[PDB]
Scaffold this active site. Structure first.
Site, PDB file in Angstrom:
ATOM      1  N   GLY A  44      36.666  42.413  33.385  1.00  0.00           N
ATOM      2  CA  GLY A  44      35.554  42.777  34.255  1.00  0.00           C
ATOM      3  C   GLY A  44      35.910  43.852  35.279  1.00  0.00           C
ATOM      4  O   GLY A  44      37.076  44.032  35.622  1.00  0.00           O
ATOM      5  N   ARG A  45      34.877  44.566  35.735  1.00  0.00           N
ATOM      6  CA  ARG A  45      34.969  45.651  36.697  1.00  0.00           C
ATOM      7  C   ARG A  45      33.820  45.468  37.682  1.00  0.00           C
ATOM      8  O   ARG A  45      32.722  45.110  37.276  1.00  0.00           O
ATOM      9  CB  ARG A  45      34.719  47.040  36.081  1.00  0.00           C
ATOM     10  CG  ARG A  45      35.679  47.542  35.006  1.00  0.00           C
ATOM     11  CD  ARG A  45      35.153  47.643  33.568  1.00  0.00           C
ATOM     12  NE  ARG A  45      33.812  48.213  33.412  1.00  0.00           N
ATOM     13  CZ  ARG A  45      33.508  49.375  32.822  1.00  0.00           C
ATOM     14  NH1 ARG A  45      34.433  50.138  32.257  1.00  0.00           N
ATOM     15  NH2 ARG A  45      32.258  49.799  32.856  1.00  0.00           N
ATOM     16  N   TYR A  48      34.286  46.107  44.101  1.00  0.00           N
ATOM     17  CA  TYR A  48      35.395  45.697  44.968  1.00  0.00           C
ATOM     18  C   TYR A  48      36.663  45.271  44.214  1.00  0.00           C
ATOM     19  O   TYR A  48      37.695  45.104  44.865  1.00  0.00           O
ATOM     20  CB  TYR A  48      34.903  44.625  45.961  1.00  0.00           C
ATOM     21  CG  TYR A  48      33.878  45.217  46.927  1.00  0.00           C
ATOM     22  CD1 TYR A  48      34.219  46.300  47.738  1.00  0.00           C
ATOM     23  CD2 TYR A  48      32.555  44.776  46.971  1.00  0.00           C
ATOM     24  CE1 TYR A  48      33.299  46.888  48.595  1.00  0.00           C
ATOM     25  CE2 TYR A  48      31.621  45.367  47.814  1.00  0.00           C
ATOM     26  CZ  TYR A  48      31.996  46.420  48.630  1.00  0.00           C
ATOM     27  OH  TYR A  48      31.095  47.014  49.463  1.00  0.00           O
ATOM     28  N   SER A  49      36.613  45.111  42.875  1.00  0.00           N
ATOM     29  CA  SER A  49      37.798  44.677  42.138  1.00  0.00           C
ATOM     30  C   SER A  49      37.707  44.945  40.641  1.00  0.00           C
ATOM     31  O   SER A  49      36.626  45.216  40.132  1.00  0.00           O
ATOM     32  CB  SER A  49      38.053  43.213  42.343  1.00  0.00           C
ATOM     33  OG  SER A  49      37.132  42.419  41.632  1.00  0.00           O
ATOM     34  N   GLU A  50      38.866  44.829  39.977  1.00  0.00           N
ATOM     35  CA  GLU A  50      38.954  44.653  38.534  1.00  0.00           C
ATOM     36  C   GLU A  50      39.592  43.294  38.239  1.00  0.00           C
ATOM     37  O   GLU A  50      40.514  42.857  38.948  1.00  0.00           O
ATOM     38  CB  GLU A  50      39.726  45.809  37.888  1.00  0.00           C
ATOM     39  CG  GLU A  50      39.004  47.140  37.984  1.00  0.00           C
ATOM     40  CD  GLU A  50      39.610  48.313  37.220  1.00  0.00           C
ATOM     41  OE1 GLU A  50      40.857  48.483  37.232  1.00  0.00           O
ATOM     42  OE2 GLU A  50      38.816  49.091  36.627  1.00  0.00           O
ATOM     43  N   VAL A  51      39.083  42.613  37.205  1.00  0.00           N
ATOM     44  CA  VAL A  51      39.568  41.291  36.866  1.00  0.00           C
ATOM     45  C   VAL A  51      40.190  41.291  35.461  1.00  0.00           C
ATOM     46  O   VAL A  51      39.704  41.939  34.543  1.00  0.00           O
ATOM     47  CB  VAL A  51      38.461  40.249  37.073  1.00  0.00           C
ATOM     48  CG1 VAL A  51      38.827  38.902  36.479  1.00  0.00           C
ATOM     49  CG2 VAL A  51      38.114  40.076  38.555  1.00  0.00           C
ATOM     50  N   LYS A  66      42.417  38.944  39.920  1.00  0.00           N
ATOM     51  CA  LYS A  66      41.511  39.858  40.598  1.00  0.00           C
ATOM     52  C   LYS A  66      42.288  40.847  41.481  1.00  0.00           C
ATOM     53  O   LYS A  66      42.777  40.478  42.543  1.00  0.00           O
ATOM     54  CB  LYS A  66      40.550  38.998  41.426  1.00  0.00           C
ATOM     55  CG  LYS A  66      39.463  39.749  42.183  1.00  0.00           C
ATOM     56  CD  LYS A  66      38.657  38.797  43.050  1.00  0.00           C
ATOM     57  CE  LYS A  66      37.555  39.453  43.839  1.00  0.00           C
ATOM     58  NZ  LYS A  66      36.671  38.412  44.419  1.00  0.00           N
ATOM     59  N   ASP A 154      26.359  34.355  47.585  1.00  0.00           N
ATOM     60  CA  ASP A 154      26.262  35.121  46.314  1.00  0.00           C
ATOM     61  C   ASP A 154      26.106  34.149  45.146  1.00  0.00           C
ATOM     62  O   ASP A 154      26.771  34.338  44.126  1.00  0.00           O
ATOM     63  CB  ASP A 154      27.471  36.031  46.099  1.00  0.00           C
ATOM     64  CG  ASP A 154      27.229  37.185  45.143  1.00  0.00           C
ATOM     65  OD1 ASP A 154      26.060  37.563  44.960  1.00  0.00           O
ATOM     66  OD2 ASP A 154      28.217  37.689  44.586  1.00  0.00           O
TER      67      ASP A 154
HETATM   68  C1  LIG Z   1      35.310  41.940  38.813  1.00  0.00           C
HETATM   69  C2  LIG Z   1      33.843  41.644  38.954  1.00  0.00           C
HETATM   70  N1  LIG Z   1      33.471  40.226  38.991  1.00  0.00           N
HETATM   71  C3  LIG Z   1      32.066  39.948  39.330  1.00  0.00           C
HETATM   72  C4  LIG Z   1      31.704  38.491  39.563  1.00  0.00           C
HETATM   73  N2  LIG Z   1      30.304  38.363  40.079  1.00  0.00           N
HETATM   74  C5  LIG Z   1      34.057  39.412  37.956  1.00  0.00           C
HETATM   75  C6  LIG Z   1      33.898  39.764  36.615  1.00  0.00           C
HETATM   76  C7  LIG Z   1      34.420  38.969  35.611  1.00  0.00           C
HETATM   77  C8  LIG Z   1      35.120  37.805  35.927  1.00  0.00           C
HETATM   78  N3  LIG Z   1      35.572  36.976  34.887  1.00  0.00           N
HETATM   79  C9  LIG Z   1      36.239  35.805  34.828  1.00  0.00           C
HETATM   80  C10 LIG Z   1      36.379  35.230  33.547  1.00  0.00           C
HETATM   81  C11 LIG Z   1      36.914  33.976  33.416  1.00  0.00           C
HETATM   82  N4  LIG Z   1      37.046  33.254  32.251  1.00  0.00           N
HETATM   83  C12 LIG Z   1      36.770  33.501  30.822  1.00  0.00           C
HETATM   84  C13 LIG Z   1      36.564  34.885  30.322  1.00  0.00           C
HETATM   85  C14 LIG Z   1      37.819  34.160  30.003  1.00  0.00           C
HETATM   86  N5  LIG Z   1      37.298  33.380  34.594  1.00  0.00           N
HETATM   87  N6  LIG Z   1      37.871  32.129  34.697  1.00  0.00           N
HETATM   88  C15 LIG Z   1      38.067  31.974  35.998  1.00  0.00           C
HETATM   89  C16 LIG Z   1      37.644  33.077  36.749  1.00  0.00           C
HETATM   90  C17 LIG Z   1      37.621  33.219  38.154  1.00  0.00           C
HETATM   91  N7  LIG Z   1      37.581  33.406  39.286  1.00  0.00           N
HETATM   92  C18 LIG Z   1      37.146  33.987  35.820  1.00  0.00           C
HETATM   93  N8  LIG Z   1      36.619  35.211  35.956  1.00  0.00           N
HETATM   94  C19 LIG Z   1      35.285  37.441  37.253  1.00  0.00           C
HETATM   95  C20 LIG Z   1      34.771  38.227  38.278  1.00  0.00           C
HETATM   96  N9  LIG Z   1      35.106  37.771  39.600  1.00  0.00           N
HETATM   97  C21 LIG Z   1      35.677  36.582  39.941  1.00  0.00           C
HETATM   98  N10 LIG Z   1      35.881  36.517  41.225  1.00  0.00           N
HETATM   99  N11 LIG Z   1      35.431  37.711  41.765  1.00  0.00           N
HETATM  100  C22 LIG Z   1      34.979  38.430  40.780  1.00  0.00           C
END
Ligand SMILES: CCN(CCN)c1ccc(Nc2cc(NC3CC3)n3ncc(C#N)c3n2)cc1-n1cnnc1
Length: 330
Positions: A44-45, A48-51, A66, A154
């Protein structure tokens, strides 16, 4: 000036705690070892971050990383402090570690991995029971965080991870969350458009936990009516128009009057005059199996303009919509 407001519940929880609980600017971060983690793939992108998915090579555990883009030090500490305060709470994602990424020279938060069921697939095969179950599980997370002096700010479907196989739910992304303090004026530029409470849309800054209860109602409406999103605004102004065509304009203007809110003049030409609608008008053959009297009563009590008059998380959990889920969970 606007009339002040206090939360009806958990009002002074942060006042009664020691300052270090909520005074996150003074938090010092504990850094782990960045060499413990090897990135596997990007998930994910965002602004504020890349995950990323990663592996902890120390114990072979799958993890989610993150990596922050530039953000103010104090908001990094805010997110970290909130995650630490909420650790072990029901259905709250666990922050497992924090490291300094050598490439961005910015902080990376390390989270528990959840094996998320594809949102589209899940949202198309949910039973009435499943919705009750998962709503109950979200409400536990919200009651806990609210009782711990924290508003998520959120809540929306993509911030709820569900592993349907294991009936496991986690509320994620605490990067907008804040500590509730009576009398504090907060930023209204939070939450995604379709999930914004009326308080945000009319620029009433002295809001509280009840914001999250509005967002939850928006989620619930979309699930039971199979209408995603339920309030489909074209911009922040038109979002309140969409709300007004359902909740009606009379209760809106009562809300404005009661808190002496100065309404942006742009709104007067567009809000119009709209009756409060009955929920039956969103009920169709395709969604009927998900709608019940109990669901409509519950939903009605979440979606109020007046943030003081919305159900609290604990009240919500006591509603008849959840009677079967509560009994089975015992
Ligand atoms: C970067 C943009 N954000 C926007 C958020 N509204 C963002 C985008 C994708 C993600 N994806 C995942 C995927 C998975 N699990 C599955 C795919 C294997 N998990 N498991 C735990 C967490 C967490 N914490 C997580 N996260 C997580 C986020 N994220 C989480 N916390 N802040 C952003």
């Amino acid at each position: 000036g606007p009339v002040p407001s206090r939360a009806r519940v958990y009002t002074d929880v942060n006042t009664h705690r020691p300052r270090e609980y909520w005074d996150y600017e003074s938090h010092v971060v504990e850094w782990g070892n960045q060499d413990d983690y090897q990135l596997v793939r990007k998930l994910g992108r965002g602004k504020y971050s890349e995950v990323f998915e990663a592996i902890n090579i120390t114990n072979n555990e799958k993890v989610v990383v993150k990596i922050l883009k530039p953000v103010k030090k104090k908001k990094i500490k805010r997110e970290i402090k909130i995650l630490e305060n909420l650790r072990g709470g029901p259905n709250i994602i666990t922050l497992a570690d924090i490291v300094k990424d050598p490439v961005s020279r910015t902080p990376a938060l390390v989270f528990e991995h959840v094996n998320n069921t594809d949102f589209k697939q899940l949202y198309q095969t949910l039973t009435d029971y499943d919705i009750r179950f998962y709503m109950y599980e979200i409400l536990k997370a919200l009651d806990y965080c609210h009782s711990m002096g924290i508003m998520h700010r959120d809540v929306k479907p993509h911030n709820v991870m569900i592993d349907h196989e294991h009936r496991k739910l986690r509320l994620i992304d605490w990067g907008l969350a804040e500590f509730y303090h009576p009398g504090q004026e907060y930023n209204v530029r939070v939450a995604s458009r379709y999930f914004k409470g009326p308080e945000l849309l009319v620029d009433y800054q002295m809001y509280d936990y009840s914001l999250d209860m509005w967002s939850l109602g928006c989620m619930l409406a979309s699930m039971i009516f199979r209408k995603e999103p339920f309030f489909h605004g074209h911009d922040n102004y038109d979002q309140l128009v969409r709300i007004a065509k359902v909740l009606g304009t009379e209760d809106l203007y009562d809300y404005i009057d009661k808190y002496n809110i100065e309404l942006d003049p742009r709104f007067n030409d567009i809000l119009g005059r709209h009756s409060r609608k009955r929920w039956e008008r969103f009920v169709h053959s395709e969604n009927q199996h998900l709608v019940s009297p109990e669901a409509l009563d519950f939903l009605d009590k979440l979606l109020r303009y007046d943030h003081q008059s919305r159900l609290t998380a604990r009240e919500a959990m006591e509603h008849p919509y959840f009677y079967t889920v509560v009994k089975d969970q015992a």
